[PDB]
Amino acid sequence: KKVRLKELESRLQQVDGFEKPKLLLEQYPTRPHIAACMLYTIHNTYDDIENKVVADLGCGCGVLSIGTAMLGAGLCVGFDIDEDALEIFNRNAEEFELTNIDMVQCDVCLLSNRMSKSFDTVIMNPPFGTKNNKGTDMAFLKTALEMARTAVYSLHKSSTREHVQKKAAEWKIKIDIIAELRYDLPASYKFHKKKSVDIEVDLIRFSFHH
Amino acid sequence: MKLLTHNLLSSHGFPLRLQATEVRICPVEFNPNFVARMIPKVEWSAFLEAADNLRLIQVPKGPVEGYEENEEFLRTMHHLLLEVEVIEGTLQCPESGRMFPISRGIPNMLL
Numbered sequence: 001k002k003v004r005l006k007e008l009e010s011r012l013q014q015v016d017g018f019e020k021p022k023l024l025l026e027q028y029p030t031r032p033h034i035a036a037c038m039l040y041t042i043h044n045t046y047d048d049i050e051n052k053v054v055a056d057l058g059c060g061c062g063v064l065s066i067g068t069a070m071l072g073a074g075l076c077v078g079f080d081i082d083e084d085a086l087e088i089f090n091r092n093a094e095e096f097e098l099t100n101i102d103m104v105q106c107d108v109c110l111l112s113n114r115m116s117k118s119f120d121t122v123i124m125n126p127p128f129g130t131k132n133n134k135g136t137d138m139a140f141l142k143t144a145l146e147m148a149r150t151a152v153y154s155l156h157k158s159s160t161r162e163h164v165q166k167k168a169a170e171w172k173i174k175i176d177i178i179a180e181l182r183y184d185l186p187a188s189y190k191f192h193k194k195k196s197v198d199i200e201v202d203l204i205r206f207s208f209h210h
Numbered sequence: 211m212k213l214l215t216h217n218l219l220s221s222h223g224f225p226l227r228l229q230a231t232e233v234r235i236c237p238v239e240f241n242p243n244f245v246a247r248m249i250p251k252v253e254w255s256a257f258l259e260a261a262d263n264l265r266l267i268q269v270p271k272g273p274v275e276g277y278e279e280n281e282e283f284l285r286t287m288h289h290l291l292l293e294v295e296v297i298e299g300t301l302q303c304p305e306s307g308r309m310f311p312i313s314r315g316i317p318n319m320l321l
């Protein structure tokens with residue numbers, strides 16, 4: 001009953017994206033090749049999806065949540081600030097016929113300690129935007145670590161790897177660079193890089209001390 | 211919104227008060243291994259009051275002795291925690307009294 005990388009990637013290509021994306025919210029979806037590789041690794045290498053309660057922070061239209069549910073999560077909960085994004089996700093959840101999914105509209109930066117150590121795994125492709133000197137991906141990362149009991153899987157810029165590792169030592173949590181991914185933003189996007197790929201991201205696995 | 215989700219949202223003390231105008235039954239494949247590992251994690255007061263408000267009957271008062279081996283308890287808990295979805299309703303913050311709408315199964319916690 002197991003799913004190979006190519007099969008999962010082909011199924012994630014059926015996930016409908018942002019209809020009218022919001023530029024200030026960084027509404028770009030995780031590409032099926034990026035998402036499949038990421039999820040396949042979480043389940044096959046670390047076994048952090050099957051019979052787990054997973055949280056998807058900034059779930060958008062659901063790419064990472066739909067794949068997590070398909071890999072055997074007991075429950076996958078997606079969190080997003082935008083209603084329009086969750087309506088597409090809710091539609092994808094109905095169409096894929098996935099019954100192990102839930103959704104919450106909220107600000108991940110303004111989350112309550114009501115969900116402290118309430119999830120087994122937290123997965124995310126967070127926004128990178130600067131919000132009062134702090135990058136959103138790091139504000140999402142501190143929330144994720146407070147919520148996850150076992151692991152956090154996140155995408156952070158490779159250029160800023162030094163700051164992520166420095167914060168892991170400060171937070172006294174384990175860190176592991178799983179992969180170095182290189183994807184471009186949707187071709188629809190107006191301001192692409194001309195000397196390189198748009199996003200040079202690191203797939204990172206954060207874990208806790210025993 | 212499932213009752214397991216309500217429980218995660220309320221966890222830590224007063225839980226979010228659930229009220230519903232539309233509740234539906236959604237079959238989820240029975241996974242006994244997942245349900246049994248959720249039982250020690252359930253905040254039972256939050257769960258009992260939420261299930262009571264949704265007008266659900268024969269709700270277990272807490273874990274049974276040797277629940278890991280009791281399929282009927284695990285099927286009951288599977289049903290109550292995963293298959294009873296509030297479609298339209300509210301989540302109320304106990305301390306402020308503020309209402310958060312649940313529409314199309316999605317709670318809006320955003321102020």
Ligand SMILES: C[S@@+](CC[C@H](N)C(=O)[O-])C[C@H]1O[C@@H](n2cnc3c(N)ncnc32)[C@H](O)[C@@H]1O
Nearest residue numbers: 025028029030058059060061063080081107108
């Ligand atoms: C990079 S996209 C993630 C796309 C999603 N993982 C997918 O594959 O479709 C970032 C997402 O974070 C959401 N977002 C932005 N700021 C947020 C915040 N303060 N709290 C929660 N979600 C937020 C955006 O609405 C967007 O859906």
